Amino acid sequence: EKLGDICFSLRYVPTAGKLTVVILEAKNLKKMDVGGLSDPYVKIHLMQNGKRLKKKKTTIKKNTLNPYYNESFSFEVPFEQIQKVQVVVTVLDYEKIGKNDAIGKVFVGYNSTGAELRHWSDMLANPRRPIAQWHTLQVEEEVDAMLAV
């Protein structure tokens, strides 16, 4: 059941309606293709009502299960909408040929629970303060069911 964990920061500036996500690192990632190499990268999606609104991606790290990224991404989300959105973070194994397999995902924001809700609520309660937290990756099938319209 151990897919890995991902650390990212969240920051929200209500006046400008700027939501910043910094992908910091991932650890203990599942090795997807046994025998070969693990080349992880991270995708970030901004979602609302089951729709992917914006998609961003990190660089690809080669031959590691414990990649460091330190890559920042910003989204424009007005303060009247911030409580309705979801930020979805997926770690995938890059392959030059074939669909890239997801290792796992997590989401924060509307309809999140547990530690993910706590991270989002901390961000909202502290305008302009970046907040970093570790999250356990979950299998995509379960996260997708929760995100679907």
Query: How far, in Å, CA of 62 to CA of 31, rounded?
Result: 12
Residue-range definition of the domain harbouring residue 6: 1-149
Tell me how long the chain is. 149
Q: How far apart are CA 71 and CA 102, in angstroms?
A: 19
Kindly state the DSSP code that residue 84 receives in the 8-state scheme.
G
Question: How is residue 10 written in tokens?
Answer: 């969240």
CB 122 within 8 A of CB 11: no
CATH classification of the domain holding 19: 2.60.40.150
Q: For the chain, what is the domain count? A: 1
